[PDB]
Symmetry: D2
Subunit: 213 residues, 4 copies
């Protein structure tokens, strides 16, 4: 395994939040865990909104391809910035930065959430889980990948709440050549198992990349 340390700080419609935590993961298994505690009270919004913010290092890649997030550990790393747009008009801006120790990844992530209306499902208990996603990944030259995915939550209703996520991963050194020399996209299937309250949050996440299913 590898050890994970995680801190998440930001504001949602102006309200400050912070979570602190960690877990473990096993990249050859594409599995990781992260359990985290709010250090400033009950969160003011559904904690399910943060499962996807609580480490692409832990994803399996298909035979022939190296996880370029993993491969970046010993060569200056990478950052990821996501703009997320929710169907009710709210916007989540997320920055991900990482530090590595022999045997550990530490992430420091910043969130800025603005524009969720007062009647937003994020201010209810309506969200019962985050659903699986497949991200489309392709290079933009040798140091950058561009990501896009749709992402939904299941509501008590039946019924779904949706968003669109666009991401930009900037790499210090050249992306692993298996990724660059590929010439079509790579797809990243992700799902979470979430066990949340309003002040303690936990995920198990599975990440499996593929060219074809």
């Amino acid at each position: 395994a590898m050890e994970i340390e995680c801190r998440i700080t930001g504001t949602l419609n102006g309200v400050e939040f912070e979570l602190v935590g960690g877990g473990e993961g096993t990249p050859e298994q594409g599995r990781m865990t992260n359990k985290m505690k709010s250090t400033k009270g009950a969160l003011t919004f559904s904690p399910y909104l943060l499962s996807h913010v609580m480490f692409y290092h832990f994803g399996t890649y298909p035979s022939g391809y190296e996880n370029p997030f993993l491969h970046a550990i010993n060569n200056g790393g990478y950052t990821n910035t996501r703009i997320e747009k929710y169907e009710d008009g709210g916007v989540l801006h997320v920055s991900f930065s990482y530090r590595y120790e022999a045997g550990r990844v530490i992430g420091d992530f910043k969130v800025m959430g603005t524009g969720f209306p007062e009647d937003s499902v994020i201010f209810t208990d309506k969200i019962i889980r985050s659903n699986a996603t497949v991200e489309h990944l392709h290079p933009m030259g040798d140091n950058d990948l561009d990501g896009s995915f749709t992402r939904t939550f299941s509501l008590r209703d039946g019924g779904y709440y949706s968003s669109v996520v666009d991401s930009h991963m900037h790499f210090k050194s050249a992306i692993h050549p298996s990724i660059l020399q590929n010439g079509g996209p790579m797809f990243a299937f992700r799902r979470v198992e979430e066990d949340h309250s309003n002040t303690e949050l936990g995920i198990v996440e599975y990440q499996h990349a593929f060219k074809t299913p």
Copy 2:
């Protein structure tokens, strides 16, 4: 079982210029396979024929154990329409509507394209595009009669670049969507890839479609 006949007509305008293709092929849903070769009736196309590969039948897709192709299922009960809005990174938009007609072992697409807003310097008026890359669409039901889809779609360019688009789709069903799809916990994913053999009068694809919950 086997091998359904496909007929296809594509008409439309791209930046004002009327175009029209006709042709068809065949396909095997159990394999997730279809073919379609089509010819221009109005002379050479003014833009890359790769732009029409994904307009040249979601009936021809495999679905995992336990689930049925809802597009397939609809054939025998009121059917479905699909309308795509595709926004190209240089500002071009294609609006595409698919309508279908059904005969014994035969499926007939009549599709309308309105492309607008593409800049004179667009890659689509060059020969830069050399194939369409694979995609995975996120599909989720909207109530009982509708599926919403979204996917990012890229073309590879001669120089090693990419030309990209975002497609948003809305599928409306005349009868209820097959219960295997409605009872699902979350989205279904639809992986599609094409093999293209194009000129700008004489276009052909082979398409593979494989839906899954998990890869």
Copy 3:
């Protein structure tokens, strides 16, 4: 100084075919026009307000120094407009506008495809009470194309808003009037409609005022 207006609108809204015919008159120099149109298929299955902005950019004032490019196009092969409108509940309206001219008369034939409006959409209720005003940002895409974009709202009976984003593509047969092209910087087009609508009978009065700076 008033041209006669004739108008047909045909389309579908989530599958359902609708058709309106009618007309009015307008005076460019005032930036004013009227249009009254009646459904040919009994009551509409959606808010009539949805059609107000489909119910003639010719009838717009332009500042001194400038000529209305729509009005200028009349005698030089004309223009088309295609708008892609994306409503905040996911509905999409794609509208195409084409024009015929005779002396003192413009004849419009308009095509609408609205898709993806959820069954809980405000457009299936009576809550929309009026469209609100807009300012479109317009700039040349080259010598024969205009790109427009605006935000549009309706007011809802209870005090809310239902919003959309409209992106428009105006393609001209001949060069755009030089004053708009030699501009460099956008032009802005303020529009407001007043509506007097039933579910079968629609009527508008519209004011259009283009500007580079507001007073």
Copy 4:
């Protein structure tokens, strides 16, 4: 006048930047000025990208309306957050916050810019000016305004570089009732004069809101 102090911090495509300075302006006139210097050497991108980050307080409103941004100065103020999408795929996320003093508004502004490709116009000297814009503003209940505008730059060759800008303004106290009770949008016309080098940036800006243009 009021005096204007301002700080801008952010990163563009990973590169940290900072500017400090200020200027002044006259809300009755809808005019303000702001001159800023980089405190980490030359910018790595066109300084034109920053003119619209370099104070909605300095905008006129039509008779029978009051500037709700200026009204907010005593009753707890507002923030503004904008997402800006450039046509080449770059994104600017900008947060605006303020503090007040007697005859002074003090802005502190955070920009994060990502995903501008290596071939983007922002890495050239093609931009020659920011063009005029008209923002559509309307309320989301009593303490929120929603903004949207399209924004272009003119390029040396005669082309344009564009972006679409979505803004969210949150008010601590209810918006001015002249705005809340409009029952339509208010439109905000804005235009800029710019004289920038890669280290020293300066604009003049005018802002005039209106219900109808005439």
